[PDB]
Design a protein around this nucleic acid. Structure first.
Lengths: 70, 70
DNA sequence: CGCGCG
DNA sequence: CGCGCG
């Protein structure tokens, strides 16, 4: 009856996988689309990087790329 | 019914003002010596630094010395 | 303001 | 793990 963070994780993963290898996005942009708090978006983005689905580039703010192996 | 920001500020300010000239303390130490969450301790420490009561030296964890004015 | 942090 | 961030 409850959808913890897993549904957020799934929404974010689906979004990043839709990116072109050459494109990138940010937490603020993602938060804006999925209408979710940037904090929630970040909690998933960093977890997703641990799974190698996305790659973060320490820009200001960080830019997120889909793993090019995809 | 709860010790608020302003009140924790006073508690932290007193501990820091009781340090000898060149000795420091850390947020976790104050957290332990007192019965307050580390986050709440740091919230006060950085404000105390803005007020020139304490001085922070980066390290892990950050060291907090009494400002020489005191 | 980069912050994800338990 | 540095985090204080409203």
């Amino acid at each position: 009856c409850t959808v913890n963070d897993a549904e957020i994780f799934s929404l974010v993963k689906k979004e990043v996988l839709s990116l072109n290898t050459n494109d990138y996005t940010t937490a603020i942009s993602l938060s804006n689309r999925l209408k979710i708090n940037k904090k929630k978006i970040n909690q998933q983005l960093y977890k997703l990087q641990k799974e190698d689905t996305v790659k973060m580039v320490p820009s200001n703010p960080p830019k997120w790329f889909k793993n090019y192996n995809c």
